[PDB]
């Protein structure tokens, strides 16, 4: 899959038309596994704390990608960034000029999850959500942990399985209310949000 062509050819039309975009097998088996190993490596540290709101049953940690031993995570973020900036101007009307750090989040199992919410209800500047799923051979039927999105204007449901090496894009605003149904198995994911310049200016005001 040509990196920069995938954007204009799939992610851009998919996101504009339907509002959600999924890219399976983004990097490959060995890459994804190196990411997972680095993540669980971080998981043994014990530096994970409870997730925060602007209910949610995950423990997370922020990664900038510049940390030693997180080289592969940084590689991922560099890819996502290259894609975004390459898209810039084409995604809806957005002009993306920033992003958050990476949120490495873990659901312990035990049925905890994230109640129905919206990532940017108040217009804080976040216009796109990216989530990288690295959970290998995840059996949703028994493991739950499904991401259910309720698209605005569409009658159908959007059910995302946290499959390993899966990349997820969607509008962060009120167009995509989502929830993480109870997870009965360890559920790891890496997130990052992308900021629109103008809306970002509005939030300061």
């Amino acid at each position: 899959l040509p990196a920069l062509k995938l954007a204009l050819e799939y992610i851009v039309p998919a996101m504009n038309k339907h509002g959600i975009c999924v890219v399976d097998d983004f990097l490959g088996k060995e890459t994804g596994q190196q990411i997972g190993d680095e993540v669980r490596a971080l998981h043994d540290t014990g530096k994970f704390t409870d997730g925060q709101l602007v209910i949610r049953g995950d423990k997370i940690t922020w990664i900038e990608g510049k940390e030693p031993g997180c080289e592969t995570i940084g590689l991922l973020m560099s890819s996502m960034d290259d894609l975004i900036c390459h898209c810039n101007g084409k995604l809806g009307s957005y002009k993306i000029n920033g992003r958050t750090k990476a949120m490495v989040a873990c659901y312990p199992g035990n049925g905890t999850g994230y109640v129905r919410h919206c990532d940017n209800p108040n217009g804080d500047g976040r216009c796109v959500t990216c989530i990288y799923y690295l959970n290998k051979d995840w059996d949703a039927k028994v493991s739950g942990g499904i991401l259910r999105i309720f698209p605005e204007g569409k009658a159908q449901f959007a059910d995302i399985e946290p499959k390993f090496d899966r990349l997820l894009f969607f509008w962060s605003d009120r167009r995509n209310p989502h929830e993480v149904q109870p997870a009965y198995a360890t559920r790891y994911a890496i997130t990052v949000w992308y900021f629109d310049a103008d809306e970002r200016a509005a939030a300061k005001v």
Partner: peptide, 19 residues
């Protein structure tokens, strides 16, 4: 509107991007 105000903390810093 099926939204809720229970948004994930956007975090602490923002990273410059593209320009």
């Amino acid at each position: 509107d099926a939204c809720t105000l229970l948004a994930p903390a956007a975090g602490d810093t923002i990273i410059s991007l593209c320009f």
